[PDB]
Subunit: 208 residues, 2 copies
């Protein structure tokens, strides 16, 4: 079944912790968003790990460089997955993958954040480098779905994000989407917990 | 004259503050580096601003998205310049620019961090969005030097960085480099304050 993921893009610590706590049990994956990490730093990751010793935890660093160092700094905090921006060189991605695998051999992975003009040849390089997650951001239609389908076809576990709603999941019917990332659709609600069960309920209806 | 900038890429706050305090008067620009911000959050910017009321301070966020939030978050902390990764979309770069100018009308600017396969038509797009700084990274030679000249010639103030020794500023002679960014050559020297002087002295012979 497609994972439900919550992205915490709050500009402060309390916002991220409060949303995480109110939706934690309704979701599969918890993501410390980039906006948030740039504000509060990496301790946030260790807090999420303590609150959710079993959840999958994402450190959304959008790493462009010093991959071994950034990957390491977040892995010691308890992160399972870290994002690298697609414009990171292959050596950066491999340095990052190596480090998250050393600290976290259980679950350590890199996910590629897809921004601007990337290519399928680049996509093949990521795969050849041991990296098979990619995150596809909804365009700001069929042009998007085809990109998602092709990335799946190539061997990626594909996460999709960018304005989602409990009612716009059926648009992905028959697609092997690995993870749905909901941010604001949950992190403003309320009964965010219920909003999140809603999302998870729809996924169940459509993929069960 | 070409600026000298130190990149604070430490994985902890004490490392960033110590290096800044010890080399700050030797440099023209102080940069809170991505690795560091991802660790300690944006308060670092505020304490640098407090330590150096007049210096130019860089928040190296390599923002890929939510440009308005990330630029504001760092501008209210006192940042003068903020990096966006070259794969961020134009609207993202515009939102970032508008936020930083809104809070820092005097010195507020965006810098484009060049990673991966960017184009001169992307480059031109940045200029049209009112953004005129780029930061070019040495590759892991003539090919590099030539890219810098072309960027200067389009109307960017180009910053150059990547394993810069002082002994390697000579190969840029007669090139209108706007800023040289030194990280480890300053921050891991055995005389950091001396190393920084070596750098800006060498720059003083060659240019001006
Ligand atoms: O910070 C970086 C990562 O984006 C640059 O590589 C750094 O600014 C250059 O530092 P050094 O002189 O140690 O290569």
């Amino acid at each position: 079944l497609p994972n439900l993921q919550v992205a915490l893009d709050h500009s402060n610590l309390k916002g991220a912790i409060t949303a995480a706590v109110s939706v934690g049990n309704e979701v599969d994956v918890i993501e410390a968003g980039t906006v948030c990490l740039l504000q509060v730093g990496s301790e946030l990751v260790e807090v999420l790990r303590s609150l959710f010793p079993d959840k999958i935890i994402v450190a959304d660093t959008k790493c462009a460089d010093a991959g071994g160092t950034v990957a390491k700094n977040n892995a010691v905090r308890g992160a399972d997955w870290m994002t690298c921006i697609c414009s990171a060189t292959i050596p950066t991605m491999k340095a990052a993958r190596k480090a998250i695998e050393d600290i976290n051999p259980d679950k350590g992975e890199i996910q590629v954040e897809l921004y601007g003009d990337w290519t399928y040849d680049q996509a093949q390089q990521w795969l050849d480098a041991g990296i098979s997650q990619a995150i596809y951001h909804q365009s700001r239609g069929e042009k998007d779905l085809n990109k998602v389908k092709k990335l799946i076809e190539m061997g990626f576990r594909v996460s999709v994000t960018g304005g989602l709603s409990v009612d716009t999941l059926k648009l992905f019917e028959g697609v092997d989407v690995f993870t749905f990332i909901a941010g604001r659709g949950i992190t403003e609600a309320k009964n965010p917990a219920g909003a999140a069960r809603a999302f998870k309920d729809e996924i169940k209806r459509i993929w069960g």
